[PDB]
């Protein structure tokens, strides 16, 4: 009854190889196949997101 | 793991779409077809490919027997489905399935073994850390940005109406109709024989599908449109075959989609999509019916015939009481909405506890999906 | 119908007027109290009902009052992300064993005046 | 003391009213219901709300089941009553319960455990400095402003008659009848069936209550009104459901409140309200009856039907001797009268002696309430 | 007796039964369904039929759309009812209606326009000399042979409980629930989708009804039965469809009738049949509850599932006080029991004074029935 969902780690988090091939394996995990731009907003912040926003943003 | 982004795989009878969570558009969209050769091979040394998946089967339609692994939303053949998923993961996206969670979609009313087989295949063959199965109707409501409304989703395989009020879903009001786009394709291929054009194999079925996509619309008034078409030749168009032959579609343009509204053309005695939506609304409670009238949502590729929204609004307004206000909401990108809201579902913080873990699957067998997933 | 009209007059005039005066005064006073604590960071709210919808400022206020680090808000501008951001603050209040009754995320997002005022009053009773 | 004003809370079966002492009207008026969801919850990220109480329980009544904590003036469920009191104190008035004393109202003839549990709850949990419990029909006489008279209070839970002469109340002449607007709503829901309308769920009961509050009246002569309703259609009225459907109540309008005067429509063996008031008058002594004839006071929301006063006066005049003068005093503000009386009782300088202190409760347990109060 | 024997007609939602007075068994039993052709008409030279009525419509379900005139105990379509009555009088019983009085049955709580229309049809069109209208529960108590008891009658359209003590009925204690066999058939159709069997058209409704009648039972303990069914393959039955396919029902057998005791499976918030019977008993007086407890009578086709009596006794005994015993008297004849009672009511000499004469109908009109019956 008294716990916080967000403070807990995600459930799927719970469970030799060449270094360059490991680097190419964990470079492919990003959606753009490269580390994200630091000072760039994500896709949700951008206004070219096709889905309509909340009503208060429309009034603003 | 903030770095790990889940893959959203919108899985339908006609097309398969795939992408990453938090993206506005899927990365890879391709038809879900499997083809095998049907003619003798006399040139040695050309190769040894015996199965064509995706656009490679669509390009070489001449020498293949195209067939669909998914029929009416049910995976009839599972080997071809494994083929499609392998081609999706390795060749279209170039990702390792063992590093990411996978989000999958299905129709509301299904045989119960379909979910168990899907979960078992995704956990054993691909070694995914986690997976989840969602219903395609809820994801359209996620994409529309509203918490309340009725979702009418008609794709290539199945049509279904699901009402949700204030984030709460009524299961007894969910309606499923097996009328879909392949039945419209078969009806078009049947009625095209009146003008002398015969299409009989699978490649010509793809040709008829292209004709239906390019040259079709829904008439606001059926009898007036029929009288206009009989009066003159203003409602005529020309299409060029890959043979270079030119055919004139003529009267049939508004006759193929009309089978959605009058299923008696196809021999089925079921009600139309407008009557199904009205029945699903009227099965709900009295107090919430106005909000469901104000927030009707259209989804799926099959609902992109021109003028379907006006006809739907007119028919529902005729059925509904006069004092109520009727609105039909049809986004211009609705074909991908089932995918898009799904990505939103993978982007939420509270959804990270809703994944079916590999450890939970190992503990509870394949039947964990019934008690974990809606 | 005449006495019915008189009763509707009474419960249209006095019950509305007293409640509206009290809630206007409470709104001004709560706005000043929130602005005093929110001025430590570079944050300021003009309207209590409108600026508290998105749920970010509630998280900032709870972070200032409590003194530890709440989870960062969900990166979005939709209604669902708004509900998530309000629910994070409500769950953090559920940590501190502060008792909230008839309080949901959608009530704050839609902008019900009485429940927002009650939430601010409950926060004031706790953290003073 | 001067700036501190004790809170006045009128707590009937139907609706709860609350405000400050010295005020002419209560600040917060809201129905006393506690609702809980019943359907599926499928949208992830909308938040969890276990219980809905008060006015915003009415707004979302489509997806909720509604329960009344108070039945026939008796608190059957105490947890929901704590929910209602907390919502009253914090969300509605925004006052700390430690700051001000609390004044409560109740029915005359009630079980002792109700009073004991009320005292225990208001001291142990809300931590109030003082509290008093009074009778509603006594406070109605305070609102009227006269020393002597007989009060007939009819709310949503129970009806009761008390006589008071010169500030002295007769306990043996107090009469209690379990016939209120709750049973009238049930009777209207039963008699609406024969016209083809069916209301069964708890959400539709509020619609039936609204229909009763909008389109009901008391006929001065029952048989003549029935003959008029049979002869012509001028008595028919139309109501609009929330889904836009239109119903015609017609003959039922004067048949639902007529069960107050003839309980045999409900199967009850008890007498009518006019006979109950007359019997309560004749249970008193001979000398005061004349004064009790001249100051009959109506109160409660059930007595808001049009034409109730004329019918009551006619029935009492028929029962009483002809040489006496019979008048019925019904102010337009008779729904809130009890609360007004409470404020008038709460602001008296003398009544500051009669508060039950917390120290007295700590000494005497919850049994202190019977020695004080009434 | 020198009097022409009256015809007794039981007119329920599912089946129609008809026979002569004083006979132990009805002569004609047939479903109350009116089918119509839907396909294209070829092969000129064979006779055409306007519509198919009753058992013949069951013989040719493939080429017809099948419809019910009675829905939820209310005659929605009157032309189909006139056709069914004509087929009853002239084809099945092959008697002249103008020579025989007619006894009809109906539900307890229903619109008065139904009674008025049945009286108008049976006097104006069929030209019967006399008629009477009765409540099915009273006839069930007549057939049981006891004067005192409570009757729970559940047909294909409606369920109702009526307590009668020594020939006196309590109108306030009569309860009506709109939960019958057709809702169970729809629920069975919905839950058969999990195993992969699809039944959509009106012709498959009768097949699903046959599956429900042949392979369903009520479990004594629901959770233990679910655990036993999930544990092994001890409980599966095979049914052969009219196309030759064989289906296996398994788990669903005790899940379809369980919705009778838990209506929340269907999304309704109403109580079960055991709680309805217990509430109907509790609405009666204190003195007659002991006699009503020991004289519970079951009637109707829907109470024909195996194990319904033991389960009902267990559920009622749990709610009832421990000091008394509960008897569930379920005759093996309950499906026809109502009609049997009607025959007894048509055999009494004192009942000959209660017939509604044709001269009385000419004197007063169709509204005489409310003054004459019940
Ligand atoms: N632009 C269009 N106009 C008309 N019909 C279309 C169009 N695009 C696709 N369709 C129809 O929709 C079907 C594809 O539906 P789709 O959205 O792929 O279903 P799912 O994704 O559920 O498999 C095709 O069979 C085609 O007939
Ligand atoms: N305007 C009205 N006309 C007729 N009856 C009314 C009206 N308003 C309320 N009622 C009846 O009074 C009931 C509410 O009474 P209420 O004053 O709340 O009693 P209490 O406050 O003692 O619980 C309602 O259930 C309804 O039956
Ligand atoms: N042997 C049986 N086992 C289970 N259910 C049955 C059986 N016989 C009939 N039923 C159910 O009872 C219904 C018939 O009820 P019936 O007595 O004909 O109602 P009514 O006569 O009031 O219309 C059918 O719809 C069927 O589902």
Curated annotation (Swiss-Prot), chains B, D, E:
Any GO MF annotation of the entry: identical protein binding
Main location: cytoplasm
A Gene Ontology BP annotation from the UniProt entry: regulation of transepithelial transport
EC main group: hydrolase
UniProt keyword annotation of Glycoprotein present: no
Entry-annotated residues carrying Tele-methylhistidine: 72
Leader sequence residues: none
Gene3D superfamilies linked to this entry: 3.30.420.40, Actin, Chain A, domain 4
Protein EC: 3.6.4.-
Reaction it catalyzes: ATP + H2O = ADP + phosphate + H(+)
Residues modified to N-acetylaspartate: 1
Positions of post-translational Methionine (R)-sulfoxide modification: 43, 46
Posttranslational mods: ISGylated.
InterPro entries per record: Actin, Actin/actin-like_CS, Actin_CS, ATPase_NBD
One Pfam family, short name: Actin
Note, other: In vertebrates 3 main groups of actin isoforms, alpha, beta and gamma have been identified. The alpha actins are found in muscle tissues and are a major constituent of the contractile apparatus. The beta and gamma actins coexist in most cell types as components of the cytoskeleton and as mediators of internal cell motility.
Function: Actin is a highly conserved protein that polymerizes to produce filaments that form cross-linked networks in the cytoplasm of cells. Actin exists in both monomeric (G-actin) and polymeric (F-actin) forms, both forms playing key functions, such as cell motility and contraction. In addition to their role in the cytoplasmic cytoskeleton, G- and F-actin also localize in the nucleus, and regulate gene transcription and motility and repair of damaged DNA.
Protein name per Swiss-Prot or TrEMBL: Actin, cytoplasmic 1
Native species: Sus scrofa (Pig)
Gene name tied to this protein: ACTB
